[PDB]
Amino acid sequence: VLDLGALGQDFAADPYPTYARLRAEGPAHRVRTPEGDEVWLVVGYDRARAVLADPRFSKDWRNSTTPLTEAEAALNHNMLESDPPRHTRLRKLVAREFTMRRVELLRPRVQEIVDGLVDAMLAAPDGRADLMESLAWPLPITVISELLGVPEPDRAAFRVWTDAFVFPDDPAQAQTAMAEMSGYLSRLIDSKRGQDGEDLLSALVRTSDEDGSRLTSEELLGMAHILLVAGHETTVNLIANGMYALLSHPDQLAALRADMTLLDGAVEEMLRYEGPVESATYRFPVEPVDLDGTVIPAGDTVLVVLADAHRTPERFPDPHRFDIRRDTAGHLAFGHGIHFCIGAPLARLEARIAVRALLERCPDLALDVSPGELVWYPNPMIRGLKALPIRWR
Numbered sequence: 001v002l003d004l005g006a007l008g009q010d011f012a013a014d015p016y017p018t019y020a021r022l023r024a025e026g027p028a029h030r031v032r033t034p035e036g037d038e039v040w041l042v043v044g045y046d047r048a049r050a051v052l053a054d055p056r057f058s059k060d061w062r063n064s065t066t067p068l069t070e071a072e073a074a075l076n077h078n079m080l081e082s083d084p085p086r087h088t089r090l091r092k093l094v095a096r097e098f099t100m101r102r103v104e105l106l107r108p109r110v111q112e113i114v115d116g117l118v119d120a121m122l123a124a125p126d127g128r129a130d131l132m133e134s135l136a137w138p139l140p141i142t143v144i145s146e147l148l149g150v151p152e153p154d155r156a157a158f159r160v161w162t163d164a165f166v167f168p169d170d171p172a173q174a175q176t177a178m179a180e181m182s183g184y185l186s187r188l189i190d191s192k193r194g195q196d197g198e199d200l201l202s203a204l205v206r207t208s209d210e211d212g213s214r215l216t217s218e219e220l221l222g223m224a225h226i227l228l229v230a231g232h233e234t235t236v237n238l239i240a241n242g243m244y245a246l247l248s249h250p251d252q253l254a255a256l257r258a259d260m261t262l263l264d265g266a267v268e269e270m271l272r273y274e275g276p277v278e279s280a281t282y283r284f285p286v287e288p289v290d291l292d293g294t295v296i297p298a299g300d301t302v303l304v305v306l307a308d309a310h311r312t313p314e315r316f317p318d319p320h321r322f323d324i325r326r327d328t329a330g331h332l333a334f335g336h337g338i339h340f341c342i343g344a345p346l347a348r349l350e351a352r353i354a355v356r357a358l359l360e361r362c363p364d365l366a367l368d369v370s371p372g373e374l375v376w377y378p379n380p381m382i383r384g385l386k387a388l389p390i391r392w393r
């Protein structure tokens, strides 16, 4: 039983060697996450892609040996933590809001938010800033908050709750944060009743009130929570991890600067090279599963390591090479199967507009600290930085 906790920041900063080491012996391994969670890891691209879409692996806690806590049980009635038919029904409720055509209409506004954030950033007399605080965090929370209808003065509370979910001081902090967020969402939800709002939450509230059978109040709350949190810590880290990748690879940054039509390709390679999701969300086998000899008992917690999949040579030649011109087709940065990220088009839009704005307005943009000085968060499911110092002329 490998204990990831005893590996420290060394493993947090560069977990790849550890994963590949495990991939060499087999596809599934038992480990102890930093928080003390005894879980299973699935490494290797082929096995990883298969498991993500293998119906034998449920996301419904009723099939999990580990029980939900009281505060967690208040938010699990959402699509990411359910199997069909519930999943089918819940996702249908919002699929239409996230199509590429629907998201494209948001381009003008996303552009506004980015230009404003960059305007403010370039106001620094020293030509220095923390990209995490100036853009990576502000952009994502602003967009999703406007789509759902979260008042501006309430958006700060989320960075706090979100942090307590990722790198909580103690187990209790996370639980308290959930209870608070849970209480806030219920109040936000109730405040929309009778107000004729046209934001997504208001529509959902109307749907639930009209027929509690199509969307129960537990699910309304669950839906509001998943849409706000599943795309927060992820888009934030994509922007930051992606810019770090570019800034730590001068040659690639130059090629993109020279030819901006490589942008879309650059963004995909960022997802594949330094995607924010190191490990997918909890899966629980509904029956004992045998992965090439290793048997994962029913009920155990399983984590598909997307990061290791992205470094499998057979799938991505010269894995450790960050190449924006590389063939990325097949990466699992957004998952695979029925739970495939519903916010992918919106994630891609924000990332594309943010990367272009920095390259075209920050002359001689450069990393303002050495790669080795950067600090990464411990949590195995999330790949993200504590801060990203940058500078320009």
Ligand code: HEM
Binding pocket: 052, 079, 080, 081, 087, 091, 144, 226, 227, 228, 230, 231, 232, 234, 235, 236, 238, 275, 276, 277, 280, 281, 282, 332, 333, 334, 335, 336, 338, 339, 340, 341, 342, 343, 344, 346, 347, 348
């Ligand atoms: C670059 C940013 C993003 C990445 C890399 C990402 C990644 C993922 C991944 C890996 C999954 C499935 C994981 C699993 O199967 O356990 C997923 C699911 C999901 N994502 Fe994203 N996501 C991002 C942005 C977004 C955005 C912007 C939203 C919100 C608008 C969002 C909403 C969701 C939801 C609600 C699900 C559940 C889908 C379902 O269960 O049917 N994601 N995302």
Ligand SMILES: CC[C@H]1OC(=O)[C@H](C)[C@@H](O[C@H]2O[C@@H](C)C[C@@H](N(C)C)[C@@H]2O)[C@@H](C)C[C@H](C)C(=O)/C=C/[C@H]1C
Binding pocket: 068, 072, 073, 075, 076, 080, 081, 165, 166, 178, 229, 230, 231, 233, 234, 276, 277, 278, 279, 280, 281, 379, 381, 382
């Ligand atoms: C969709 C990929 C990202 O994951 C999340 O957003 C997960 C689902 C979210 O997980 C947990 O949030 C709690 C508030 C409720 C809990 N459930 C038991 C009711 C749910 O599993 C994040 C808060 C967890 C991780 C740490 C994260 O920040 C994002 C990870 C992405 C992989």
